């Protein structure tokens, strides 16, 4: 059988997804919990040119704020007591495919920045030093909070907003 989309506003949103097909600009999805955000990311990617490519979805809340900037990107050896190898990255694992960051508002100012730098340059370095890796990952942010607000609270970098705010989809409860 199939999936489920039939209400006007969604009859719509599906198409918006379909059009966005041939694209790679990041996408910002927003709706209350349960509305289908992460279901749209997944669909956007099933529809993007890189459907067959991996889907690296990671809940930004499912990781202590102090280790996100260690697992998203990666880690350069001996910089934090105990390192079995410079740590790879979800960015690197998502290289060539999609990287669905769920619950964006929960990004530390430090990573909010560090992401921005990788959304524009596409290059990143694991900790102190310089970039030595090439990643081609389409950003897909989804959050249930109101981004704009957070911007006047200073909890959310504005320039990072507009950067992910290329394509913006809003799922109605």
């Amino acid at each position: 059988e199939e999936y489920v989309f039939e209400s006007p506003k969604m009859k719509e949103i599906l198409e918006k997804i379909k059009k966005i097909s041939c694209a790679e600009c990041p996408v910002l999805i927003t709706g209350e919990s349960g509305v289908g955000k992460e279901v749209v990311a997944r669909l956007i990617h099933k529809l993007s040119d890189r459907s067959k490519e991996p889907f690296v979805a990671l809940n930004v809340a499912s990781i202590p704020r102090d280790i996100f900037e260690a697992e998203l990107f990666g880690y350069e050896k001996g910089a934090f007591t105990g390192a079995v190898s410079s740590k790879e990255g979800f960015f690197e694992l998502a290289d060539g495919g999609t990287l669905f960051l769920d619950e964006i508002g929960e990004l530390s100012l430090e990573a909010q920045a560090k992401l921005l730098r990788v959304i524009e340059s596409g290059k990143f370095y694991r900790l102190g030093g310089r970039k030595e890796i090439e990643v081609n990952v389409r950003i897909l942010a989804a959050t249930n909070r109101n981004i704009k607000e957070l911007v006047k609270e200073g909890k959310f970098r504005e320039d990072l907003y507009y950067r992910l705010g290329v394509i913006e989809i809003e799922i109605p409860p």
Binding site: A23, C25, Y162, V166, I167
Partner: protein, 73 residues
């Protein structure tokens, strides 16, 4: 504060993307051009860059008017 820039810039962009995503989009309609000039553009040049890449992709025919734009602006 450069409404004399919105329509030219926008037109720049609409060209970039129309060519970037191989879309038969030639340009904005009057009705649309108005809107673009009224929007406050907080993001300024940046926001317009996005608003239009987005409008180029969402585009269905050869032109863009209140239709796709209102979706955003």
């Amino acid at each position: 504060e450069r409404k004399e820039d919105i329509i030219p810039l926008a037109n720049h962009f609409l060209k970039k993307f129309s060519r970037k995503y191989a879309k038969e989009v030639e340009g904005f309609t009057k009705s649309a051009q108005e809107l673009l000039l009224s929007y406050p553009w907080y993001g300024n040049v940046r926001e317009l860059k996005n608003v239009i890449e987005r409008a180029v992709l969402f585009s269905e025919g050869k032109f863009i008017d209140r239709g796709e734009l209102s979706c955003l602006v």
